[PDB]
Write a protein that binds this ligand. Structure first.
Ligand code: CU
Ligand code: CU
Ligand code: CU
Ligand code: CU
Lengths: 587, 300
């Protein structure tokens, strides 16, 4: 239409590669945060962003397992710099019409001045890294211009895809959107012996949705626009309006809106991460006629490394979409051998229309993510994918002695919560229907009682954990909304999912009237791609999720939280501490 | 058949060549034992092994008769390392059917926990070598992580093929299987004067049979499996069961199951050693119709 960007007008780029490992461990690699001008699209003007080394995404850091590395994340954004991200909250639109976050522009609403007034204040978190809390990017310890955050990463972890981004307390949703994100690949001998496509044929893909502001006649102007929609104008408990997380109509891949990539008719490896604030990409690979393309994509790794077996992603009805929530990583082989001279598209699928078809109304006005243009060669790729991938993979057993956490996730309108969803840490009991008490009727048909002991980031510490121990964490989502939960430090495995009836939960009370009931005639199968190592799993509701993990290889104070950046900036986050068992004896 | 490897799917490799002779005899060549992942077959995942210089087979050492050589066989396998070889003993199975050592997997049986607890404890024996007992790899004198066994080999012996391998007291059967073997060639003027095929045309072949573990659905998982068969469950004299030696279904040549080798229509020299625990290979050269080929092989 008039005023729309043409998809696939510009080629894909990849961030420059950084290899920081050296003989001299005391010689840090400075990674300087600097303002930079970014061409999102040939049809836009340049866009002001903040980049690690002036690049968006940041450089792709590459290391080998065991190579000890030191990085100085160094704020070089001058005092007085314009804040790259304009922020607005806008009214709801007419019902049954596309929400305003399906559109650019502010619709008359004034940029929020308090965001405009943000100085550069940043802390970098290497998401997925096994490293002590002093290295982790703790949210309060963001630094201003001239100052550094120093991180050691021992990198004593199997080959995987990590990624790094701003984590500044309360403002992570803006800082990350400004451009502070990048990926970080660890290599090892096990991965090497797989003989995976590499060099030219290994492509990091950092995808993120954006919105843009518009000029006064409605022309897009390239300015980053964090636009949310108000679902409650005035919250009964507080003064304040209440808004949903960020979703935008434009999809960026490696810092470009809707790029194309020229590839050969061979095997390729994609290191995919969703770096979006909140959007879940339900990805489908489709051909010129919008037909999903089976038998071509294979998932081979996940957050924490190689899967035990490759998972076919055939966009059939065993896995119709590859669902990628914020912060999740997918190690994908795609096999273009039979596809020379073809053009294929990765698209976000809307719930209300086929893959490839706009569904503005399902939150996907523009399906396009990126295009592959496959050149016919006369070459023969004999790459072999084995049926078992990793010989190192050992399945997590519930038989290993472990401790237990229950984390309840609550509906937004819950009592005492100011209209926001929350993390509630729960402790079991051994004054029935009361505030902060939740009963649960388990599978075995019996009922336990739990009390709420923390509801927000700054409540007193709940989880203190001996280094080297295993713990099973249950996330019990009592709401209809999906929270991609993330735990710093550790690798976990998914043990089980169960559906619940949660209509026993009284929002106005903030407790159960009648118990939350496991619902055993709704099986929730595990996704076929979540049986490896994960550190950020999706938790729909009403449901419960069982993960297990070894808290291993480092110490300190760490975070777990929701990875919708808006919910994270609004209290949906908790600390935990990992100490030597021997220091645990002193409390 | 479903779940079977395709023979001849990957090319033969040869260990890298090592040439330790030097003008300063007091400068040892360090040969460090390390964990390594090796791809036995394209249809398998990578396999955990222990290798001399991270190589399985270890490097082909080459020396001339009279070149005095000192080697520090140096344990660099980190403490806490997973032991690479899984050990089980399984019951007989029905008479007139293939023995269980004919099949991959453990069947029901538990990995032996004592073998799984082994730390890396190795001593290296140069099999063939004429050198004093101090150098020969006495079996009790295995070394743990961070230490070395030092060996002088005067190499005063006519040209031949020797081979080297772990010789650790009581655990040799697992250590060698873990990957600790390689070959060692001595050259001299007499063999040189025969002008034998050399370079590209001399190929060491270290053959060894192996067994592998399976997952629950019975897929091969690349994990080294030392699986022996119980022939007497309770020996009258001792508490304990008695099992036969190791035999396994897969043949590796230079660390690859059933490789192929591209050669020219010319004379080749093969330096063949059987590094198996126990299997005696009864070797036949056959053609595409399975006919044995006469007039082609000569042992020298
Ligand atoms: Cu993290
Ligand atoms: Cu449990
Ligand atoms: Cu959330
Ligand atoms: Cu001997």
């Amino acid at each position: 239409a008039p005023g729309e960007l043409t998809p696939f007008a510009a080629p894909l780029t990849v961030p420059p590669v950084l290899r920081p490992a050296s003989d001299e461990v005391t010689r840090e690699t400075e990674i300087a945060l600097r303002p930079t001008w970014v061409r999102l699209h040939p049809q836009l003007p340049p866009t002001l962003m903040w980049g690690y080394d002036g690049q968006v995404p940041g450089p792709t850091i590459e290391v080998r397992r065991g190579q000890r590395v030191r990085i100085a994340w160094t704020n070089r954004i001058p005092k007085g710099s314009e804040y790259p991200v304009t922020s607005v909250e806008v009214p709801l639109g007419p019902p049954g019409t596309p929400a305003p976050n399906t559109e650019p522009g502010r619709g008359g609403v004034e940029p929020n001045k308090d965001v405009a007034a943000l100085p550069a204040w940043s802390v970098t978190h290497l998401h997925g890294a096994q490293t002590g809390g002093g290295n982790d990017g703790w949210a309060d310890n963001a630094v201003g211009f001239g100052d550094a955050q120093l991180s050691e990463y021992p990198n004593d972890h199997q080959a995987t895809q990590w990624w790094y981004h701003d984590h500044a307390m309360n403002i992570t949703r803006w800082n990350v959107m400004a451009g502070l994100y990048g990926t970080y690949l660890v290599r090892d001998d096990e991965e090497d012996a797989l003989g995976l496509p590499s060099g030219d044929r290994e492509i990091p893909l950092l995808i993120a949705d954006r919105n843009l502001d518009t000029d006064e006649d409605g022309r897009l102007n390239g300015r980053l626009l964090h636009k949310t929609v108000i679902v409650q104008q005035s919250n009964p408990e507080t003064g304040k309006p209440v808004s949903i997380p960020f979703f935008g109509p434009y999809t960026t891949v490696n810092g470009r809106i809707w790029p194309y990539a020229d590839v050969d008719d061979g095997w390729y490896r994609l290191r995919l991460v969703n770096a979006s604030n909140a959007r879940i990409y339900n990805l489908v690979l489709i051909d010129e006629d919008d037909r999903p393309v089976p038998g071509v994509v294979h998932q081979i790794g996940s957050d924490g490394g190689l899967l035990p077996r490759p998972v076919p992603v055939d966009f059939d009805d065993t896995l119709p979409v590859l669902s990628a929530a914020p912060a999740e990583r997918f190690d994908l082989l795609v096999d273009f051998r039979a596809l020379g001279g073809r053009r294929l598209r990765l698209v976000d699928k809307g719930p209300g229309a086929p893959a490839g078809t706009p569904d503005p109304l399902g939150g996907v006005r523009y399906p396009e993510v990126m295009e592959f243009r496959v050149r016919e060669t006369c070459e023969e790729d004999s790459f072999a994918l084995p049926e078992v991938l990793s010989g190192s993979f050992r399945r997590m057993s519930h038989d290993i002695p472990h401790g237990h956490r229950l984390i309840v996730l609550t509906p937004p309108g819950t009592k005492g919560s100011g209209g926001h969803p929350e993390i509630w840490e729960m402790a079991e009991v051994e004054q029935v229907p009361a505030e902060g008490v939740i009963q649960v009727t388990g599978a075995d048909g019996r009922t336990k009682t739990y009390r709420r002991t923390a509801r927000t980031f700054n409540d007193g510490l709940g989880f203190t954990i001996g280094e080297g121990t295993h713990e099973q964490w249950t996330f019990l989502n009592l709401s209809p909304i999906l929270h991609p939960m993330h735990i710093h430090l550790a690798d976990f495995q998914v043990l089980g999912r169960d559906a619940y009836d949660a209509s026993g939960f009284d929002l106005a009370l903030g407790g159960t009237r009648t118990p939350v009931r496991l619902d055993p005639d709704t099986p929730v199968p595990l996704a076929p791609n979540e049986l490896g190592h994960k550190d950020v799993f999706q938790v729909p509701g009403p449901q419960g999720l069982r993960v297990m993990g070894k808290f291993d290889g480092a110490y300190g104070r760490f975070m777990y939280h929701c990875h919708l950046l808006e919910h994270e900036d609004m209290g949906m986050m908790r600390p935990f501490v990992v100490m030597p068992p021997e220091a645990l004896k002193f409390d």
